[PDB]
UniProtKB/Swiss-Prot annotation:
Residues 22-50, 102-108, 165-174, 274-288, 339-346, 409-414 are extracellular. Gene3D superfamilies: MFS general substrate transporter like domains (1.20.1250.20). It comes from Bos taurus (Bovine). InterPro entries: Fru_transpt_5, GLUT, MFS_dom, MFS_sugar_transport-like, MFS_trans_sf, Sugar/inositol_transpt, Sugar_transporter_CS. This is Solute carrier family 2, facilitated glucose transporter member 5. D-fructose binds at residues 14, 149, 263, 271-273, 362, 394-395. One of its GO terms (molecular function) is fructose binding. Coiled coil: none annotated. GO terms for biological process: cellular response to fructose stimulus; D-glucose import; dehydroascorbic acid transport; fructose import across plasma membrane; fructose transmembrane transport; regulation of systemic arterial blood pressure mediated by a chemical signal; response to fructose. Functions as a fructose transporter that has only low activity with other monosaccharides. Can mediate the uptake of deoxyglucose, but with low efficiency. Essential for fructose uptake in the small intestine. Plays a role in the regulation of salt uptake and blood pressure in response to dietary fructose. Required for the development of high blood pressure in response to high dietary fructose intake.
Length: 437
């Protein structure tokens, strides 16, 4: 039960690394600045420290983009569980890199570690539902729709409570907080080895029938069912180019690009990355920020443990529309209470509610649904190529929002969220006019 739950818990390690850089950030930037003139001797420019931190944060979703490309040759060779072991021992390297980063320097042990810890996440985000998908029985499969998403939300919360001002978030304790991401990796390297392998991979790729049957009975019925990896071999798979070329799939491709971009450019990760800096940016006391972000993640989990049943029962289109609308109206009123701060103390309580109300709205339609629709609206042939398009749009949008947002709230100030409302509005219009159930 516990190890069964901790088997797919690689999603937790993703959720951890997303918010893991929010809390220590204040104490971390100092580490950059004084390390700089402890070598060079001159102070680092105010902008370049902001440019360098934007890199630290945005290397993670960039690494995921690279790492998500490798999932194809890896699982076609190493296997599902095999690849899952590969990145785990490979996840220890960036983990201890940040943990011992206290010793030498940030320039490598952090930034180069962030891209390396991103490769693991972008890689597992495919393999994990892939490994769990082939193991699951025929009829009962899709119960995993919001299930790993729940673990991502917990990872965010854990990083926030461990990133509390009191516990690991401080000058001396932050490397322990960063390096703590390797603990569930070394924890998974224990329980997973005696977990069953992939039956579909062993029979088809490895051509071993005895290896497929033995792991099947743990759970020639399913054995002959795997002949659908033969029938599908003749059907072939559409390329990424032919996706755009096909007039049949155009309003599909256009939609997932809009959904994946809209989801990420909505500024959802702009929060979990920058939440500490976001709350400070309006009404919140320097002490209160570390406490309120921890609550924002708690709310996020409560909505996610809800939306698992809500997503399938309430429909695909409505929840999607309702979400981007809430995320739109929460941006206006926020940009908003940020704009005029003279009404304090009346304003800041509103701003905090706006961030919470945004999280709630995004955690229903915008976050879970787009990934689901790609599996549905695309045929088996175009499904592998469709995934890559959606994936590339997701990570690179995630990349840019993590990149530009410090410069946005620096440049646009209290208007920082105006660009997100424009996105939410444009997305809500598209998913209204075009996308049906």
């Amino acid at each position: 039960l516990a190890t069964l739950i901790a088997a797919f818990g690689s999603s937790f390690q993703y959720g951890y690394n997303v918010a893991a850089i929010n809390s220590p950030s204040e104490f971390m930037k100092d580490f950059y600045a004084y390390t700089y003139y402890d070598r060079v001797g001159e102070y680092m420019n105010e902008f370049y420290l902001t440019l360098l931190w934007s890199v630290t944060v945005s290397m993670f979703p960039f690494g995921g983009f690279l790492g998500s490309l490798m999932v194809g040759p890896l699982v076609n060779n190493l296997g599902r569980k095999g690849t899952l072991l590969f990145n785990n021992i490979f996840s220890i390297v960036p983990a201890l890199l940040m943990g011992f980063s206290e010793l030498a320097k940030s320039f490598e042990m952090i930034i180069v570690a962030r891209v390396l810890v991103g490769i693991c996440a972008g890689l597992s985000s495919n393999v994990v539902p892939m490994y769990l998908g082939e193991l699951a029985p025929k009829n009962w499969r899709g119960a995993l729709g919001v299930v790993p998403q729940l673990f991502i939300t917990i990872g965010i919360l854990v990083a926030q409570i461990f990133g509390l001002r009191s516990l690991l978030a401080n000058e001396e304790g932050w490397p322990i907080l960063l390096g703590l991401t390797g603990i569930p990796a070394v924890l998974q390297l224990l329980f997973l080895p005696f977990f069953p392998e992939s039956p579909r991979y062993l029979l088809i790729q490895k051509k071993d029938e005895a290896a497929a049957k033995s792991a099947l009975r743990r759970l020639a019925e399913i054995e002959e069912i795997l002949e659908e990896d033969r029938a599908e071999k003749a059907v072939g798979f559409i390329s990424v180019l032919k996706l755009f070329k096909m007039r049949s799939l155009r309003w599909q491709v256009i939609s997932i690009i809009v959904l994946m971009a809209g989801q990420q450019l909505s500024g959802v990760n702009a929060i979990y990355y920058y939440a500490d800096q976001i709350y400070l940016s309006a009404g919140v006391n320097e002490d209160d920020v570390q406490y309120v972000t921890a609550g924002t993640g708690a709310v996020n989990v409560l909505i996610t443990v809800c939306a698992i049943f809500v997503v399938e029962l309430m429909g695909r289109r409505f929840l999607l529309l309702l979400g981007f609308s809430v995320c739109f109206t929460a941006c206006c009123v926020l940009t908003g209470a940020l704009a005029l701060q003279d009404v304090i103390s009346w304003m800041p309580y509103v701003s905090i509610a706006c961030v919470i109300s945004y999280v709630i709205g995004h955690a229903l339609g915008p976050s879970p649904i787009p990934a689901l629709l790609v599996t549905e609206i695309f045929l088996q042939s175009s499904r592998p190529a469709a995934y890559m398009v959606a994936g590339t749009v997701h990570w690179l949008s995630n990349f840019t929002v993590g990149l530009v947002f410090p410069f946005i709230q620096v440049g646009l100030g209290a208007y920082s969220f105006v660009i997100f409302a424009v996105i939410c509005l444009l997305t809500t219009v598209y998913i209204f006019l075009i996308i049906p159930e």
